[PDB]
Design a protein around this ligand. Sequence first.
Ligand code: CYC
Ligand code: CYC
Ligand code: CYC
Ligand code: CYC
Ligand code: CYC
Ligand code: CYC
Ligand code: CYC
Ligand code: 45D
Lengths: 179, 67, 161, 161, 161, 160, 160, 160, 296, 42, 4
Amino acid sequence: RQQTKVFKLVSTYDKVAVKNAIRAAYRQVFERDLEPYIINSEFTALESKLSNNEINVKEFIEGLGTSELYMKEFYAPYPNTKVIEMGTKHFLGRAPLNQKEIQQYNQILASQGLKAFIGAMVNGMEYLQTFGEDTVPYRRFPTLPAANFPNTERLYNKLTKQDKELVVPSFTPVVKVGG
Amino acid sequence: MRMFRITACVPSQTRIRTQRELQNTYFTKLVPYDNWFREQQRIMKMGGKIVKVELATGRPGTNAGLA
Amino acid sequence: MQDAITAVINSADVQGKYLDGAAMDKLKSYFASGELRVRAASVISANAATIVKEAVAKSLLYSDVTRPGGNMYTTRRYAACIRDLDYYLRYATYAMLAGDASILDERVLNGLKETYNSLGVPISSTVQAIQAIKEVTASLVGADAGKEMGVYLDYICSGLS
Amino acid sequence: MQDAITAVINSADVQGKYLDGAAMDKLKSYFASGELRVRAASVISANAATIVKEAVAKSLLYSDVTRPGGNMYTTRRYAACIRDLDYYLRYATYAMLAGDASILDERVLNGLKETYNSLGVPISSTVQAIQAIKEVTASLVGADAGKEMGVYLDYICSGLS
Amino acid sequence: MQDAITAVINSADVQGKYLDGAAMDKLKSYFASGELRVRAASVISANAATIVKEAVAKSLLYSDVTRPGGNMYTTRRYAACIRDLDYYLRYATYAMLAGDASILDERVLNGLKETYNSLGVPISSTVQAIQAIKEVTASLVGADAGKEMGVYLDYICSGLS
Amino acid sequence: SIVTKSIVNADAEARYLSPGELDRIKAFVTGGAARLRIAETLTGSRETIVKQAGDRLFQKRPDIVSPGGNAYGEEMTATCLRDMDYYLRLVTYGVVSGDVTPIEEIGLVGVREMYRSLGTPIEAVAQSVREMKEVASGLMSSDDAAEASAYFDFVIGKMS
Amino acid sequence: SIVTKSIVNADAEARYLSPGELDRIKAFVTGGAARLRIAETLTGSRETIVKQAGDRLFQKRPDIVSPGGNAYGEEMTATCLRDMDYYLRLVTYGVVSGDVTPIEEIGLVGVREMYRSLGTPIEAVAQSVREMKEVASGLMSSDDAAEASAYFDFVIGKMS
Amino acid sequence: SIVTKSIVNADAEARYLSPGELDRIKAFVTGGAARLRIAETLTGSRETIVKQAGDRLFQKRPDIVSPGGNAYGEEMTATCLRDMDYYLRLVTYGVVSGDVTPIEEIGLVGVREMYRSLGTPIEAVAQSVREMKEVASGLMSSDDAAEASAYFDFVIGKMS
Amino acid sequence: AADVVPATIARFSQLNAEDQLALIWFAYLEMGKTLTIAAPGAASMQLAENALKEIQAMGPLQQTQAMCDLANRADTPLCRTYASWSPNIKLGFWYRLGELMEQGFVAPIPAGYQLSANANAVLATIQGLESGQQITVLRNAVVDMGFTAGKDGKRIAEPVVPPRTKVSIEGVTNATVLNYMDNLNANDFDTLIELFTSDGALQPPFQRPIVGKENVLRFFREECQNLKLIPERGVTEPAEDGFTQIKVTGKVQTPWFGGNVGMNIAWRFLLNPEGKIFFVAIDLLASPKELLNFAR
Amino acid sequence: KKLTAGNPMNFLGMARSINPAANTIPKVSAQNINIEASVPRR
Amino acid sequence: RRFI
Ligand SMILES: *[C@H](C)[C@H]1/C(=C/c2[nH]c(/C=C3N=C(/C=C4\NC(=O)C(CC)=C4C)C(C)=C\3CCC(=O)O)c(CCC(=O)O)c2C)NC(=O)[C@@H]1C
Ligand SMILES: *[C@H](C)[C@H]1/C(=C/c2[nH]c(/C=C3N=C(/C=C4\NC(=O)C(CC)=C4C)C(C)=C\3CCC(=O)O)c(CCC(=O)O)c2C)NC(=O)[C@@H]1C
Ligand SMILES: *[C@H](C)[C@H]1/C(=C/c2[nH]c(/C=C3N=C(/C=C4\NC(=O)C(CC)=C4C)C(C)=C\3CCC(=O)O)c(CCC(=O)O)c2C)NC(=O)[C@@H]1C
Ligand SMILES: *[C@H](C)[C@H]1/C(=C/c2[nH]c(/C=C3N=C(/C=C4\NC(=O)C(CC)=C4C)C(C)=C\3CCC(=O)O)c(CCC(=O)O)c2C)NC(=O)[C@@H]1C
Ligand SMILES: *[C@H](C)[C@H]1/C(=C/c2[nH]c(/C=C3N=C(/C=C4\NC(=O)C(CC)=C4C)C(C)=C\3CCC(=O)O)c(CCC(=O)O)c2C)NC(=O)[C@@H]1C
Ligand SMILES: *[C@H](C)[C@H]1/C(=C/c2[nH]c(/C=C3N=C(/C=C4\NC(=O)C(CC)=C4C)C(C)=C\3CCC(=O)O)c(CCC(=O)O)c2C)NC(=O)[C@@H]1C
Ligand SMILES: *[C@H](C)[C@H]1/C(=C/c2[nH]c(/C=C3N=C(/C=C4\NC(=O)C(CC)=C4C)C(C)=C\3CCC(=O)O)c(CCC(=O)O)c2C)NC(=O)[C@@H]1C
Ligand SMILES: CC1=C(/C=C/C(C)=C/C=C/C(C)=C/C=C/C=C(C)/C=C/C=C(C)/C=C/C2=C(C)C(=O)CCC2(C)C)C(C)(C)CCC1=O
């Protein structure tokens, strides 16, 4: 929680910093450097826009989530339930909060697909309050609400492709409305 | 796709930040058409002032061929 | 956003003075109108979809706006127009409840005029649709509340020019 | 989350039944207890910081947990421990007002054991602290309200054990 | 972006008309050209790396552009210039396949001239490099297919200039 | 419920319930018997509220009970009155709770999906609830009707 | 069109059209004449197709043109038929372009919202297109019908 | 006030105010008369409230008005009384609006940074507000003082 | 080239204000027999609910004037409110008035009125149309009524006509009751009160007895406006202390306390041995009409 | 089986007692409608 | 449509 770096792109004059922010963005969203699973880079124009200050880090981050590469890595191999928790991990830094959030993103996936889901997370108020427009998302250590810390911990203590299991398949309800 | 180029000045309300913040305070950015309504609402709720909006990409009045 | 109370507070605070008799009167007047505003707000929320349905049928349907070549032609743009009106009515209701148009400046008239001019949305037709919303609401909430809702719907109309 | 009232409603809903006389008796019992719950809640909120301070003093301080190498040692961990005790008291107050513990199962206990066991937080020591909070708040709000708050603080402790 | 086909469809929809005789003649024209477009695209695709390499070699290398004080000097600038040329050829191919230049406006020229002027990217040298891509491409796809490609590479040049 | 609603509002801000919230709760518990009487009234006259309102609906919307209508035939007509019974019962839940969440969580979240899947014209459902609001209102004093109307209007405003 | 769709798919990967994207463009352009024929047969008998389709719809849904129905009354039946001609016109757009994008951009994005506001039962609008597909299928050879039906059915599916 | 808080909460969900929120607003405007009474009391007694509070504070904190103290000398001690008057005026704003928001936005965001820059012992500012609370609570009934206490306490709490 | 629907609408526009208004009323009567039924649920009639309350609250004279204003396009707030409504709402609004006219809540067309020669022919044309064509013509007949600021105007206004016997009772001939019933049906409260003692008391339907001349006087001014009560039969006897106890029954041809135009009523007159009334009881007799029933 | 709440059988008697009247068979004809001239103009 |  302390021994980390937060990539906050405060200027675009330093191209080395811009490139460092970009490569951190790839590592955050895709969980590692892209070279061993791309042929050629499909993000070059996106990097050009960020580097030219035409977009912000938030737009770059969403551009990564709506890319074909992201779809291949973290949508096609897994069911929509697991897509949700990997989504919040990569873009919000945490496991899903509650069943309402799982419901909310399950409807988006069921009706509009992957790009709508990414757009919902990154454009939400929580994202802007936490990471804002200029900061690459990063792992969080939420205290509240209940179970968010241990669920986020289980998500971030696994290596990529470590297993094919759901950390948060759904929150067991305490009171079944209607049952 | 159609895209807006928007300028906005978003102030700080509940904190006195010490890092440099100009980049996230007064900025100009490209927003996909399908995100502008939501994005405009978000900036407005954060107290932001939308100072300029332009249709950077696309044409007004298109019925077919939005990409 | 600021309601009628916070507006009176801000007027005194900018001058660094306590709330004097005139400011207390304004607070009293707002308090006394509270029941009427909450009544009108309850009526609008119950009929909000109906209000927009009938305002559109009265001001936009079966006209050049909705025929091919009109900005409201295509289901895509028709729905986009219906959404805008739906947001106008709800925000005019907030403004009426709060007794102050600041929420309209901040959450309606903040970049909206420039977005409309970029996309070619006709302001004239938008203002007429809003005016039709004002007519439809007055038939539902009465005259005293309908006049108040008209004040804030008019604020939006003139905000768009 | 479910309070005393929605517990009545839910029990009727799952059977698809309107509320009958017996169900209205349960709602009346809770309405009669409303004044006691509200008064206790306001006293606890106005004394929350002091309730925890005294609970910590008599249950945690000057022990292994506060000496170097201890879980409460370091200012961050001490501060986190006070914050956790603030949470338990605040959610017990929610539960006491609601007259229903379901909020504790949902917003407190869900994943709590896993959290503490992974961090090395001493479960017995936190249970002793909450029990100290139960004793302290009882001497503030009285036996009847103290025993009502005791149910929901004891509910948390039984969740952790 | 509208290809040639959608340009006709959109032109009819704004009128609310079915595809009339003239509209089908435009579609026929494009359907007849389609074989030439696809073949030329498949040739450019297989030789895009080569096409850019000779374009630069003939146009920019061993000149003051690549020498110290030139705008291609430094490996970062050289890579950026090469990247831009790769974009210009691939998008010209897109526009050539589609039969319309709208894709160039939406995905190439958006802010390009202002970017180049602010950064001091020499327009005249950039135009020569695109002309060089034109001449090399024409020698690979034949005269006629190189005439279409040249229209879209000329479109990019007009946007910059 | 009013208690749950204020608790979730307070928890969302990580704070104890405010004096304003605690005063609203105190008033609600102290006016409890008056609300339960309204709920008792609705419950006891549920047969006539649904029947009369259902009779009015089909007069107002004869198409729904014509060939090709969603409620055509006695059996489909029965399910429509059942649905009206569902929504009346929910209104009584809202009355005694002083909050709409029991109504929302049981019968308004996803209602558009449910009725579009069934082919039911949802706005006619809004009309059926509207009809129940008049019949119910005419069985009680104006002040009691106003308290129940708020919850009728919430259902109407959501489906419509 | 099929061309724009291919280009968008390729530009999403910052790469040139793959062999398959090129094959289908080549196949589509060679087939341009057959698509233009179907578009012409549909355009020629549009008046016949809609009016025959409308009568079949009414025999399926007599409620919509009876008191209380959305299309009740001469002017409303005429508007309903007007809408059937809209969606026939868009089906010809789909056929020639080889893509359902023109159909979505003009007449299926937000259609559910538009008809909600107007009170039209959208499933009956789906049935109307199901009728036009049947009537149109009889005016063309089986193969001209198989390609035309695909774009009708896309409208049917999107309106459920 | 609770009006803005309700609207802001309603606008986050792009919804109308629910019946419960409207009822809370109605109760708030009814209690407006009592809120105004308290604020008038504090405003009318402001000069005596600050003067006595200052005397009480200085006896408890002679260091601040001693040589080297931030408020040392007539000019500095008068400025310190002015700050106490500022926060009394803010507490009046909180009273009439029924919420601490005007207090937070005018006088508690960044308050530590400002006073630390001026060399003002923040705990002595917190003590002054405690003194004003004591004096003020003696000029009004138990209920009115309890009402006003929340705003006095809020200032103290944010100054710890 | 039939084009019946617009041609029929053209003929309606030519009828004078009176004929247009008379026509739609007689069209209302045919509804369900030769004309189409109404489906008010297909209109957003909540928009017209407030305007329909104002008309109901009007006096009989004002109500008819209100509807004449609609047909004459006079500039009144009701006509302005009317003009802002949608076509379906307008037609549904007129439908409600026709329903109330039959229910007696709103004043009727002049007694024994006859549809004019031209209007009857236009009606018959409508009668021969299909259902869908009928509603379209009906929609357009009323679409233009009320007041619209622009191109509008009618050649001739159609004012309402400017406009009391003794009531017979079977078995009862007491003058005190006779003056009351005639005075009541005449809305002459200034005279009807003089049949009640200064310490008299009245018992309205579904109410407790009200004791007091001024109270009973006020009640008449409030809940008995334009109210017609017909006694048909009764009986008179002395009961106690010389007081005479008459029980005359009948029917009420006007809505009253949830009653209908055809509800039977009863009076129990209790008047002094030497004259005027000390007490009276009025009780609407329940029957398959149970629309006046509350709950608890 | 004994009927339970929510079962529409519980409301069949109410449905039969209401006995709602269906609309008459419509006689509208698509072939006789001039679409262009009949669509409303506002 | 039958539910039986
Ligand atoms: C090469 C023929 C000439 C040249 C090029 C050059 N360009 C830049 C910088 C940028 N070029 C672009 C252009 C695009 N970005 C995109 O995403 C697309 C759309 C697909 C285009 C056309 C942009 C945005 C920039 C700025 C951001 C970036 O670096 O990517 C440079 C670098 C300038 C600098 O110092 O930063 C250069 C060198 N320069 C020449 O001299 C040639 C004539
Ligand atoms: C219908 C035949 C039965 C039924 C269904 C039911 N499901 C849920 C909730 C969820 N269903 C899913 C399912 C999936 N997510 C995926 O990614 C995949 C792969 C395509 C599947 C199948 C999920 C994740 C949820 C939770 C989120 C959500 O509700 O959107 C419910 C709701 C349960 C509740 O109380 O919340 C229901 C009712 N229920 C029956 O009774 C039928 C037999
Ligand atoms: C002080 C001498 C004067 C003064 C200052 C004042 N500034 C603000 C707000 C902002 N100030 C900045 C400036 C910077 N941010 C940076 O990152 C840097 C670059 C290193 C600079 C120079 C910004 C961006 C803001 C807005 C965002 C923020 O505050 O984080 C205010 C508040 C404005 C308001 O109304 O909110 C004030 C008061 N004001 C005076 O009157 C002095 C003369
Ligand atoms: C007929 C099968 C169904 C039906 C139709 C119906 N529609 C309307 C009114 C409108 N329909 C549209 C539709 C479109 N406009 C567009 O631009 C597009 C894409 C090309 C579409 C699909 C519109 C805009 C209207 C509003 C009127 C206007 O033209 O401005 C009506 C009339 C509703 C009313 O009350 O006015 C009807 C009857 N109704 C049915 O019941 C059938 C299932
Ligand atoms: C309807 C009365 C008229 C009309 C509307 C129309 N608007 C758009 C597009 C947009 N409208 C907005 C509006 C807002 N953004 C805000 O933040 C607020 C405050 C709540 C408002 C009202 C925006 C942002 C857009 C663009 C983004 C989006 O639509 O999602 C369109 C679509 C235009 C197009 O080319 O697609 C239309 C049709 N058009 C008319 O003709 C009516 C008079
Ligand atoms: C001395 C300058 C001031 C002072 C000190 C004081 N402290 C306590 C009690 C405790 N102090 C601590 C401190 C720490 N624990 C940590 O982990 C760290 C960092 C390593 C620190 C600094 C703790 C935990 C306690 C609680 C007792 C315990 O150790 O178990 C007291 C006693 C308070 C009481 O009532 O018990 C005192 C007196 N007091 C002053 O007034 C000086 C300004
Ligand atoms: C020698 C160790 C290897 C080698 C070299 C080689 N280089 C070129 C051509 C170019 N090299 C550069 C390099 C730079 N330009 C810059 O601005 C910077 C930063 C200071 C660098 C490093 C450039 C721009 C060129 C282009 C030619 C030109 O300058 O005009 C060649 C020629 C390639 C050709 O075919 O023309 C060669 C041979 N080649 C080897 O095999 C060695 C390993
Ligand atoms: C099916 C369907 C519907 C359609 C519903 C329909 C078809 C509704 C149609 C309802 C109709 C036909 C209403 C006509 C009412 C006429 C009145 C009240 C005239 C009063 C005249 C007076 C007072 C004049 C008196 C006079 C006086 C005073 C004189 O002095 C002398 C002259 C005169 C006698 C004139 C809806 C629209 C609801 C929704 C859609 C839908 O599907």
